[PDB]
Structures are given as structure tokens and as C-alpha cells.
């Protein structure tokens, strides 16, 4: 019957690449949660409240998508949310290794959670939050890579 | 609201899902079975699409491959086995599939798989490629390796369903 997917990340901030991933996932699963990590070990530019607020606005037009923060073991959060699917976007070869390791651990922690991988669209294949930030920090144009609400908020953070 | 719209795929919630899982499956292994079982748990329907005329001559012919796979996957109600002699995208279009299952074992392959996904996106924009990691148990097995091991009497009973094991032993004198 139901499929319920979690798409975890720091989303600092959410980019068009993330939006593409979640849009695609929301087309194939009944429900999707954008799970925003509360306390990443590297301090984010936006806090959880801001990240969640931005992502909510950017994803409001998707009816089966909900944005939430989480500060617990993803397996525990997935169990709490009665999620059975874990979405991960796969951009680089470097990321694949780490995500395969994590998937094997999550299989150990939650055997009933299936990890599922999406490639980013060609359009968004080179963008990351980190890269957009670094470009923007030195006044590079990133209007093409962010939704308007995120773009405005980023500009404010850097002024 | 049919008088007004037939509806669209994206931005309107969840849609009916029909996945193709293509390969040569020469023969199908427990690794493949794991992948398709997992896909069949999350998609409404799944087709195991067995390539008829692969570039490297297979040990089993299409009829044998299809027969073996059918038997090994009969316990999954939403899975069907078919042969195809086309691009995976043309078969997908023919079957009105909207999902393409791809197994992701090696880092070496990631680049090729991303390139294939971009090509399939070009050919069939409405087809989404979805990538599954193999289970840890099956992470090192391939059809090719199991065959070569079997050819020199290595034990591969753990890597194949019984019907495939028997058929493989028959192929190897």
C-alpha cells in the first residue's frame, strides 16, 4: 500500500538540485519528508529554523511533501515517521562510497528501510549548496541555481 | 475532474508506478533477485527485462534466461519476466513504464550509469532512473564471476536459486 520516503540532508540552503530530486521522488512515492538535520557537525550558514522555513516555501507547491527537522539517528526518525524508503541524491563518485557505507549501516539498524538513489538532472549535476555559497560569497550570479526565496535570504546573509 | 484534464506526472502527488529492471541475467543470481524484490516492494509493478541479443554471447539463450528468471521470481506477485530486443527506453515506452531500475555495485560504473541516465532522460523524459545498491551479502557476486567459479567446480550454491544452480551445472558438463 503506502510508500513514505525520507529525503535527509543539511539543505543549507536547499537548491534547485534538491528541489529536482524531491519533486521526482514525490512523483513516485505517496509521501515524502524533506528531513533537515538539526545539528550538523559543521555549523551551517542557515540555522534549522531558517533552513526548514526556506525549504517549506520552496516545496509548498508539492502536495505530498512535508519539511521537518530531525536531531536523531535517521533510522529512529524513519521509524518514528513510519517511513519505509530513504531517498538520497547521488552527484559525485566520492559521495557514492560514503552513501553505500551508510546504506549498509542503515540496513543493519533498520532492515525494513530501503535506501533509494537518484542521479541529479544534467542541469543541476555540478551544483551543491557549498558551491553556490562560495560563488555567492564573492558576488557570483547564482540566480539560476536557487528558488527566489532562498536567493533573497542568501543575499541577506552575505550583506 | 476528467472533463477538464487527464492530469500530469509531476507536482500533483503520487502516481501509479511501473518499473523495468533490464539486464542480460545470464543467469539471474540472488543479487538480481534481491534488487527486484526490493523494487517490487516499492513500485506497483516491475518487469524483469531480459536482453535478447547482448553483445557478448550469453551462456544461456533468451528462452532459458526468461524461463529461469520466471521460475525464480514467481513468488513475487507484481513481477513479470519478459525478453526485449530494443533500447531500454524504447521497451519502457512500449510497456508504459515510468521507472527504470539500475543496480549500483561499483564506483567504476557510477560514471557510466549517470551517463546512461542522462541519455535515457533525453530519449524518454518521463522515465525516471532509480538506483539500488546491492545487499552486502551479494555485493561481490556477478553472473560472470559465478559462472567462472562454477566452471572450475567452486561452490556457488549460496549465490543462485536452486533452479538456476541445477541449470548451470548442466551447462558445465
Curated annotation (Swiss-Prot), chain B:
Catalytic activity from the UniProt record: (R)-4'-phosphopantetheine + ATP + H(+) = 3'-dephospho-CoA + diphosphate
Quaternary structure (record): Homohexamer.
Keyword Nuclease among UniProt keywords: no
Single GO BP term: coenzyme A biosynthetic process
PANTHER family: PHOSPHOPANTETHEINE ADENYLYLTRANSFERASE (PTHR21342:SF1)
Coiled-coil spans in chain: none
Organism this protein belongs to: Enterobacter sp. (strain 638)
Site (Transition state stabilizer): 32
GO cellular component, one term: cytoplasm
Keywords, alphabetical: ATP-binding, Coenzyme A biosynthesis, Cytoplasm, Magnesium, Nucleotide-binding, Nucleotidyltransferase, Transferase
Functional summary from the UniProt entry: Reversibly transfers an adenylyl group from ATP to 4'-phosphopantetheine, yielding dephospho-CoA (dPCoA) and pyrophosphate.
Name by which UniProt lists this protein: Phosphopantetheine adenylyltransferase
Family per similarity comment: Belongs to the bacterial CoaD family.
Pathway this chain belongs to: Cofactor biosynthesis; coenzyme A biosynthesis; CoA from (R)-pantothenate: step 4/5
EC number assigned by the record: 2.7.7.3
